Structure 1
């Protein structure tokens, strides 16, 4: 998804927002402020949470050679669900 600034000015995922005057805005006049509609933060947050019953699970990210450097994230934290750094998708152990 994507939100809109008071000047309309669809705010990108980073949070950029030209304020009211901000003479630099004139470059978007007669043109379009290129913004990617797909926002990474909420486009991965809704992804299903993996349920694997092990303490350590690899996180190659699908297609080991084609994916990302395989990590060995720990699965013992029950407060929150441990996720790969590169992948971002979340691993949780079912009742550990």
Structure 2
């Protein structure tokens, strides 16, 4: 189709086949940033003429992995505290306001926090 391989989208429209070497990542088909060069166009070069594409470095896309984590829910509070879940080996500690009726991701980790009283609306 060449459209899911060369365009940046929020979510993939089809199932990622990890044996397809034209995908941007083994778990994601389309690029996850507007300036990111599509992997299909990158490998269409003179330097890839006689190389094995399967052995080239293909890390999994972080955008697909971070959103499979469940939304954290806070009980009896309006502020979520995150410090990378590692302390001195995590990220700087930040406080996340939960006033709105939505899941607000962490500025470093990407973990999406929410209030438990807003659980049903967000799951919808």
What TM-score results when the alignment is normalised by the length of structure 1? 0.72
CA RMSD of aligned residues (A): 2.7
What TM-score results when the alignment is normalised by the length of structure 2? 0.58
Whole-angstrom distance in 1 between the partners of 2:109 and 2:19: 25
Residue of structure 2 aligned with 1:91, choices 104, 107, 113: 113
Whole-angstrom distance in 1 between the partners of 2:49 and 2:97: 47
Instruction: Return the structure number with greater helix share.
Output: 2
Whole-angstrom distance in 2 between the partners of 1:35 and 1:17: 10
Structure 2 segments unaligned to the other structure (5+ residues): 1-15, 32-37, 119-124
Residue of structure 2 aligned with 1:29, choices 42, 50, 55: 50
Q: Which runs of 4+ in 1 moved over 6 A?
A: none
Contact 1:18 1:25 in 2 (8 A): no
- Residue 74 of structure 1 is matched in structure 2 by 97
Paired residues in the alignment total: 89
Q: Which one scores higher on RCO, CA 8 angstroms, separation ≥ 6?
A: 1
Larger Rg: 1
